[PDB]
Amino acid sequence: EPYPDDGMGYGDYPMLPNRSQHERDPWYQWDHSELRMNWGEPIHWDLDMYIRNRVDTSPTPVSWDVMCKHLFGFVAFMVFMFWVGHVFPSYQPVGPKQYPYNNLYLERGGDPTKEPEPVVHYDI
């Protein structure tokens, strides 16, 4: 069944089923073992992509749609829940930590010459 005549070059090259070498019977003694292709059988146009070390088209126990929806659903729910989180964070009943001097103004590398507005912390 020649590839459709739309003038993109395929020519007379057969339009062989788009199935990857992955599901070619893995036990049969394929002449070319690793391409799971026999000698003489028409090679597929994109056998450079269906090779085993590349893409696969091997039936999956779960339907593809079911997969795409489920995966992304999970992703979304998670991303969302993480957002519910940022909205409502978890923080202990503890006030802010208190650093000495002027919040270590000079040591945080502050300018020695210009003194900072004193930030004082009182007991209790």
Binding site: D31, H32, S33, E34, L35, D46, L47, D48, M49, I51, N53
Partner: protein
């Protein structure tokens, strides 16, 4: 610089006068020493460029190449001793001489003060190359490939001829030294905007740009191994050397007249890198690898920042050595396999243990593994490109991911997997094949120890 050249010329008398049986060793042994004399130019204990004489000069940019041009003639003559060992004893001495003239001409072109000396010698190199590709080319299509290699370069060449004669009238001498120390500032007219394109286009063509690179895949495919080594290692870099010395003039326009090429090259880098991903002919994949890794160079010789330039100088010398190494090992598979197809010949490490180590190191040079000059080069072009526009990392970032994929795929489907059942049994590796490789990589290891020598004019 007439020791790197006169002794070279004398090689021609030796290839002809010498015995048919001893012709190969006299020529290869002597040019190895010719390379040793070439190493003297590296002795620059000061910044001043070394103006040997009126017509012949060598500055940091040319010196790293003249040595490579002299170095590959030995190797080219060692990689073509097999094919070309079936010839009539006068076809050989022609091939050997053709290879000899290429570096005589290329040594002079890279070591030329007058820009039109570059042009005459620049476009002469096509004669020796076209003969090597067409006369000894294995495939039916080399007549075609030769035509493509002659016309794309020639149509670009005549505009440069008009441009350089034009500047001589405008300034009064095509001497690279003076042109540099003289005020040639183009005036952003519509015409100048054409001059700039005239000068750069001929160089941009033999440095395959995305728009005009179809000549290189076709040429290296049917070219004999020696021609493919010369085209990838020295011939394409002739275009880069030209762009570095010609943009000294046309200083103002490239600030805004480069965008077209820069974008052509960076998008080109991605597409050329990607089609390598599914190309059945190994020589085809290396050639497009060469287009992409050379598309980075035209995008650094145009941004024009100090780092770009020496990123370029680092990568050009490095990629030159790596590409040949890849083209040389591709040939060794081609001669035993007898087909260029990548899919056949799977599992070779199982049968050719060492060639596979050379294949692995060549691929790691091909992709950017870090203690290699290849990476330093890309890291630098990448930096400047980022400076030009932070967004550039995206496109120079899709290329790095693709470059890793095709480089390893060449190793994974050629040198791993189950062995091919019974192709014509693959005779073991000759010591010549392995040395021809060792001679490519041992210098790649040594240069990576001291990158300063191939850093370019800028640094």
């Amino acid at each position: 610089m007439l020791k790197i050249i006169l002794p070279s010329l004398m090689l021609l008398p030796l290839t002809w006068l010498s015995s048919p049986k001893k012709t190969w060793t006299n020529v290869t042994s002597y040019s190895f020493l010719i390379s040793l004399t070439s190493l003297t130019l590296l002795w620059q204990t000061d910044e001043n460029y070394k103006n040997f004489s009126n017509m012949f000069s060598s500055d940091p940019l040319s010196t790293p190449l003249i040595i490579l041009t002299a170095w590959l003639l030995p190797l080219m003559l060692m990689a073509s001793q097999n094919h070309l060992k079936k010839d009539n004893n006068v076809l050989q001495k022609l091939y050997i001489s053709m290879l000899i003239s290429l570096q005589i001409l290329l040594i002079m072109t890279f070591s030329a003060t007058e820009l039109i000396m570059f042009y005459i010698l620049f476009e002469a190199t096509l004669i020796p190359t076209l003969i090597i590709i067409t006369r000894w080319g294995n495939q039916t299509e080399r007549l075609n490939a030769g035509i493509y290699f002659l016309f794309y370069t020639l149509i670009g060449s005549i505009p440069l001829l008009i441009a350089l004669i034009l500047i001589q009238n405008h300034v009064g001498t095509l001497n690279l030294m003076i042109l540099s120390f003289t005020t040639h500032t183009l005036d952003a007219s519509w015409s100048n905007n054409l001059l700039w394109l005239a000068c750069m286009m001929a160089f941009l063509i033999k440095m395959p740009l995305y728009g005009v690179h179809l000549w290189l895949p076709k040429a290296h495919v049917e070219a004999p191994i020696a021609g493919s080594m010369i085209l990838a290692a020295i011939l394409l870099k002739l275009g880069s050397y030209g762009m570095i010395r010609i943009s000294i003039i046309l200083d103002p326009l490239t600030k805004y007249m480069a965008y077209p090429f820069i974008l052509l090259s960076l998008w080109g880098m991605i597409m050329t890198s990607s089609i390598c991903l599914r190309q059945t002919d190994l020589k085809s994949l290396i050639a497009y690898s060469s287009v992409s890794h050379m598309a980075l160079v035209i995008a650094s010789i145009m941004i024009q920042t100090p780092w770009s330039f020496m990123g370029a100088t680092m990568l050009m010398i490095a990629h030159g050595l790596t590409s040949s190494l890849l083209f040389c090992l591709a040939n060794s598979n081609y001669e035993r396999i007898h087909s260029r197809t990548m899919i056949m010949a799977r599992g070779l490490q199982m049968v050719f243990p060492l060639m596979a180590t050379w294949w692995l190191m060549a691929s790691l040079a091909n992709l950017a593994l870090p203690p290699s000059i290849n990476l330093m080069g890309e890291l630098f072009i990448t930096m400047s490109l980022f400076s030009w526009s932070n967004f550039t990392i995206i496109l120079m970032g899709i290329n790095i991911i693709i470059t890793g994929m095709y480089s390893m795929y060449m190793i994974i489907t050629t040198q791993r997997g189950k062995l091919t059942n019974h192709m014509i049994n693959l005779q073991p590796s000759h010591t010549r094949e392995l040395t021809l490789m060792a001679l490519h990589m041992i210098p790649l290891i040594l240069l990576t120890t001291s990158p300063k020598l191939i850093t370019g004019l800028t640094m």
